[PDB]
């Protein structure tokens, strides 16, 4: 069951650029009691991803309605949305391509350092685009360990995020998160936690830190739209004691 361009479809044209070059973006949302959590955030993250990938579309009002009706049906689960540049275009060229495709579907902690480092590219940073082959490789290595998630670094060694979640770590009253201007996805839950931490008593800083710098934290917290927050017990050969920040934002995140 897929809703593609306003009607149920099981298959998609092979010529679609999402299939050809993973040319597009996507978002995975939590559905609770027939409602999409942070619906507005999901639509806004789709618009910015479309903006930087130069994908022009105006079906936002129609897309919103569809997410809401699909969420009312599913009641409890996950809602996935994919937007691609559509068919067409000569080779890698965007010329004569379009119109854009929309696809919807609904469905019902220890860290290990990842041996796979994320490439650096400002033009693709932050965007939840479809080129997630680095995440597929990281996941494969992660499964060779007994960890639940992975600590992923930059090609230069900077702590960036996890495989499918963002990272926060804190010492005292200061909370830290890696700047996502060169790599990683700027999560919706990440941005939501930043809003909470900003108005709160904790101090929040967006840093560029090495592994050793982050391993000196009193606590570490993992996040994404589906968890939505998870407490971290260890990161390889370094155990964590408190879960204060986690106890703080968790009720506020759910
Ligand atoms: C989707 C994603 C996240 C989390 O995004 P949220 O919008 O907060 O759910 C984190 N890392 C990667 C690589 C992702 O694809």
UniProtKB/Swiss-Prot annotation:
Pathway(s) where this gene product acts: Cofactor biosynthesis; tetrahydrofolate biosynthesis; 4-aminobenzoate from chorismate: step 2/2
Traits of the deletion mutant: Cells lacking this gene are unable to produce PABA.
InterPro entries to which the protein is assigned, alphabetical = Aminodeoxychorismate_lyase_IV (IPR017824), Aminotrans_IV (IPR001544), Aminotrans_IV_CS (IPR018300), Aminotransferase-like (IPR036038), BCAT-like_C (IPR043132), BCAT-like_N (IPR043131), Class-IV_PLP-Dep_Aminotrnsfr (IPR050571)
User: What catalytic activity does the UniProt entry give for this protein?
Assistant: 4-amino-4-deoxychorismate = 4-aminobenzoate + pyruvate + H(+)
User: Which residues in this protein are found as N6-(pyridoxal phosphate)lysine?
Assistant: 128
> Could you confirm whether the keyword Lipid metabolism appears in this record?
no
**By its UniProt entry, which CDD domains does this protein fall under?**
ADCL_like
Quaternary structure annotation from Swiss-Prot or TrEMBL = Homodimer.
Q: Which cofactor does it need?
A: pyridoxal 5'-phosphate
Task: Describe the task this protein carries out.
Answer: Involved in the biosynthesis of p-aminobenzoate (PABA), a precursor of tetrahydrofolate. Converts 4-amino-4-deoxychorismate into 4-aminobenzoate (PABA) and pyruvate.
Which family does the UniProt entry place this protein in?
Answer: Belongs to the class-IV pyridoxal-phosphate-dependent aminotransferase family.
PANTHER family noted in UniProt: AMINO-ACID AMINOTRANSFERASE, AMINODEOXYCHORISMATE LYASE
Organism whose genome encodes this protein: Escherichia coli (strain K12)
What protein is this chain from?
A: Aminodeoxychorismate lyase
Q: Name one GO cellular component term.
A: cytosol
Which EC numbers does the record give?
4.1.3.38
Q: What keywords tag this UniProt record?
A: Folate biosynthesis, Lyase, Pyridoxal phosphate
Q: Name one GO biological process term.
A: tetrahydrofolate biosynthetic process
Tell me a Gene Ontology molecular-function term this record carries.
4-amino-4-deoxychorismate lyase activity
């Amino acid at each position: 069951m897929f809703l593609i361009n306003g009607h149920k479809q099981e298959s998609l044209a092979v010529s679609d650029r999402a299939t050809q070059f993973g040319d597009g973006c996507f978002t995975t949302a939590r559905v609770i009691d027939g409602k999409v959590s942070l619906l507005s955030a999901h639509i806004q993250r789709l618009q910015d991803a479309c903006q930087r990938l130069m994908i022009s579309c105006d079906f936002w009002p129609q897309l919103e309605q569809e997410m809401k009706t699909l969420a009312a049906e599913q009641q409890n689960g996950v809602l996935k949305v994919v937007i691609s540049r559509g068919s067409g275009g000569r080779g890698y060229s965007t010329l004569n391509s379009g119109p854009a495709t929309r696809i919807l579907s609904v469905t019902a902690i220890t860290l290990a350092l990842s041996p796979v480092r994320l490439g650096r590219n400002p033009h693709l940073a932050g965007i939840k685009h479809l080129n997630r082959l680095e995440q597929v490789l990281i996941r494969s290595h992660l499964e060779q360990t007994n960890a639940d998630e992975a600590l992923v670094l930059d090609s230069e060694g900077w702590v960036t995020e996890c495989c499918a979640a963002n990272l926060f770590w804190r010492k005292g009253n200061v909370v830290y998160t890696p700047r996502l201007d060169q790599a990683g996805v700027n999560g919706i839950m990440r941005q939501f936690c930043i809003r909470l931490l900003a108005q709160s008593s904790y101090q929040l800083v967006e840093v560029q830190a090495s592994l050793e710098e982050s391993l000196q934290a009193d606590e570490m917290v993992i996040c994404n739209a589906l968890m939505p927050v998870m407490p971290v017990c260890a990161c390889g050969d370094v155990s964590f004691s408190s879960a204060t920040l986690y106890e703080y934002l968790a009720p506020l995140c759910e």
